Structure formats: C-alpha cells, structure tokens
C-alpha cells in the first residue's frame, strides 16, 4: 500500500515548485509546460499558498482560457483539485 495523504502532499509540493520556477526563472520552459498541463488537466489556476506568483501566471496566460481575473483566483486553487483527485471528487 501507499499513503494517500503523502502522495497528495508531494504532488502539491511538485506543483508549487513548478509554479515558482515558471515565474522566477524566465526560460524554465518545462516549468511553464508542467504548470500549464496541471492547470488545463485539473481545471485550476495557481495556489493560495503562492497568491503573488499566481497572479503573475494568470496574466502570462498559463491558466485556463475564459477564467482570467485576479478576483477569481481564490476559488481556482490547484491544491484543492489535487486533494479532490486522490479522494475521488
């Protein structure tokens, strides 16, 4: 068996590292690529533990289409969609 909570925790940590590196390093192209894939797959945008850099990715169009507005970012947390994935929701 494998720990459901630990894997969720690691997947967040991986995402958080990709989110940070996509903005902090200009041409971390896989960092951007990974971040886009997560957003498009999980239907989300940034995380609430990185709201500052999240607004920066929102405006770089690495978040899903038709959802662009800083006001909405609080309800578009990927951390919550990662939780739901592994808990089957």
């Amino acid at each position: 068996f494998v720990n459901k909570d630990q894997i969720a925790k690691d997947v967040k940590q991986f995402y958080d590292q990709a989110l940070q590196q996509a903005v902090v390093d200009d041409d971390a192209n896989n960092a951007k690529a990974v971040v886009k894939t997560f957003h498009e797959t999980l239907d989300c945008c940034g995380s609430s533990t990185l709201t500052a850099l999240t607004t920066s990715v929102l405006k770089n169009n690495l978040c899903p289409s038709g959802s662009n507005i800083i006001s909405n970012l609080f309800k578009e947390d990927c951390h919550q969609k990662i939780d739901d994935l592994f808990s089957g929701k």
């Epitope: 590292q17 940070q20 996509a22 902090v24 500052a52 850099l53 920066s56 990715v57 405006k59 770089n60």
Partner: single-chain antibody, 231 residues
C-alpha cells in the same frame, strides 16, 4: 502584513572592510526552494537599485564584493571590500505575499529600458494629482508596473501593481481607495491618481517595472515625481 526590521539603523566603515546589514521578518518569507527577500541600494536623488535577488543571487552588473545570505526570517547583506561609492541607504524588501514591504533602511557612511515620469507637482489639500510613467525599451503591454512612495527622510512604501495588458491591479490595503492605477497601452504609459490629498501624501512617488515573466522584482525605476501638498 510582514514587517521587515533592519539593523543597524545606520553604519559607517573604513575602506577595507566588512559592512554587514541584517534583516528580520515577522514570519518566514521563504519556501522549500526560494526566498523572496531582496536588497536595494538607494543614493540621494536617485531611485532604488536592485542588488541581490532572492537572498543570495547578485544582479547582473553588481560587483562581487556584494553578497547576500539567509533563510526563513533572518537575512544578511555583506559588502567587502567596502568602497567609497557603496555609500547609500540599503533596503531589504520581500515579495512572498501581498503587500510587499520594505525594511526601515540602513545608511552606510564611509570613513535600453527607461521609465520617464512627470515633473514636480504642487497642489492644495483636498485636490487630486495624476502622476504619469511613460515606458520604453520593453513590451509595456505585457508587463507589471509597480508604484512606490517615499516621504522626505523616510523609507519605501509599496502602493500596488497593475498589469498593463488589461489594467487589472493589486493594491496595498493602505492605499486601496486613495490611489488608482490605470494603464494606456497605446501611449505605453502607466498612471497613478491620488485623491483627497493631504500633507501626509507629500512624498516622492516612484514607478517600477518587473521582468517578462512578472517575477516580483523591481528591475527598472523612474526618476520619481515629487508631490507636495500645501496651503
């Protein structure tokens, strides 16, 4: 709000010679891979200048004698050998959460991008000003513009930042309602308007840009707009 506390208040060192400046934060400004504390150098008249980014990384152009270190809440700027032109006030600043905040400042005694702001402005209390910041040498419409306030003698105070593409902004709660940020993409010109002016608003207002990705670093500044409210 994260509160950055620098020490000493002011320092003086001989040409030699270790200059060491501390910076403490209310809570950790760091994640598992980065902080998120930065160091700016300001000389009188001039705007601030970015020296060390993300705790340790020297900005291109900055001498090797400048070095930074730290983690979590405690950070340190070091200068050695100290040289005559290193005389300035040094501000630490974080970019972990909103609002961004600067340290109280430390003065050091020794023993194609350009942003064109509008000129000085004198106005009655109760009035409104609109400061302009015309950008050139990069793609304005894909950039974030930040505004910083600095009262005579006092330190640096972050007002907010606006994305020029759609003019969606993030304000400091202290300036939200008083300062309005707008952008004219055709002009490549950022604007800040201040309302219900007071002697309290008498300050030099700077305009600062960020990198292509919108990394939360203040790369290029304007010369500043001295606003002075009086009767």
């Amino acid at each position: 709000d994260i509160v950055l506390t620098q020490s000493p208040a002011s320092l003086s060192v001989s040409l030699g010679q270790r200059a060491t400046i501390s910076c403490r934060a209310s809570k950790s400004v760091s994640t598992s891979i980065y902080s998120y504390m930065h160091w700016y150098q300001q000389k009188p008249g001039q705007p601030p200048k970015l020296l060390i980014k993300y705790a340790s990384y020297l900005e291109s152009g900055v001498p090797a004698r400048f070095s930074g270190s730290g983690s979590g809440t405690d950070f340190t700027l070091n200068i050695h050998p100290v040289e005559e032109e290193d005389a300035a006030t040094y501000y630490c600043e974080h970019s972990r959460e909103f609002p961004f905040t600067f340290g109280t400042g430390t003065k050091l005694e020794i023993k194609q991008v350009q942003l064109q702001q509008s000129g000085p402005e004198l106005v009655k209390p109760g009035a409104s000003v609109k400061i302009s910041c015309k950008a050139s040498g990069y793609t304005f419409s894909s950039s974030w513009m930040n505004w910083v306030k600095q009262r005579p003698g006092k330190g640096l105070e972050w007002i907010g930042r606006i994305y020029s593409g759609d003019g969606d902004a993030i304000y400091n709660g202290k300036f939200k309602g008083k300062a309005t940020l707008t952008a004219d993409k055709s002009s490549s010109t950022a604007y800040m308007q201040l309302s219900s002016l007071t002697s309290e608003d008498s300050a030099v207002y700077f305009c600062a840009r960020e990198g292509k990705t919108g990394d939360l670093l203040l790369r290029s500044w304007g010369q500043g707009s001295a606003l002075t409210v009086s009767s």
